[PDB]
Amino acid sequence: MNKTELIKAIAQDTGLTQVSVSKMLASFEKIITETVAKGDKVQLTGFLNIKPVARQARKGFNPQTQEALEIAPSVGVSVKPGESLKKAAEGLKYEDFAK
Amino acid sequence: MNKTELIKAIAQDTGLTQVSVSKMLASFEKIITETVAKGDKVQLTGFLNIKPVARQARKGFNPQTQEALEIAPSVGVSVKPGESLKKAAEGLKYEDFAK
């Protein structure tokens, strides 16, 4: 699925009026990517812990070629996929992917 | 934010009909986690890409005192690094966190 397929995901799980399925998802990244950049820890049930956390602010290796460094972390992306989808996955196409 | 905060995040980015803000987001996580679990490549425009991959895990008993068994049930709900959210993070104050 994606910013469009997901519109159908709500346009079908919901469908009510197709509100902005295309616009709410277009804004979803605008709020997902923008919230972390707005300063808010979005949290999807228990799988997408959207929340920014700094972890880098330098990377110029010494006067050599590959001795890169990094002293100071600036905003980052703490969030990640949780087990809510893996538990849902162990329940629908987990073995389907195995074979 | 969360299954309700992000709701208004789209209910406001939408404001068309507030479709089911409650049913589209509660189901969006139910479909986000359920799609990857259904076995579809869930993703977000160009910053997130949740994808499940048949995998497994084992060596922590359970039916007794837990700490010794040997199974392997664990799909791999991978994901992506939406830089649009990290680059947006540069917008919130990435360096401000580095200092």
Curated annotation (Swiss-Prot), chains A, B:
Any one GO MF annotation of this record: structural constituent of chromatin
Region annotated May be involved in preference for HM-URA DNA, chain positions: 52-77, 90-99
Record bears the keyword Transcription regulation: yes
CDD domains: SPO1_TF1_like
UniProt KW keywords: DNA-binding, Repressor, Transcription, Transcription regulation
Portion annotated as DNA-binding: 61, 93-94
Keyword Transcription regulation: yes
Pfam families hit by this protein: Bac_DNA_binding
Record note on quaternary structure: Homodimer.
Similarity comment: family membership: Belongs to the bacterial histone-like protein family.
Main function: Selectively binds to and inhibits the transcription of hydroxymethyluracil-(hmUra)-containing DNA, such as SP01 DNA, by RNA polymerase in vitro.
Protein name: Transcription factor 1
Organism: Bacillus phage SP01
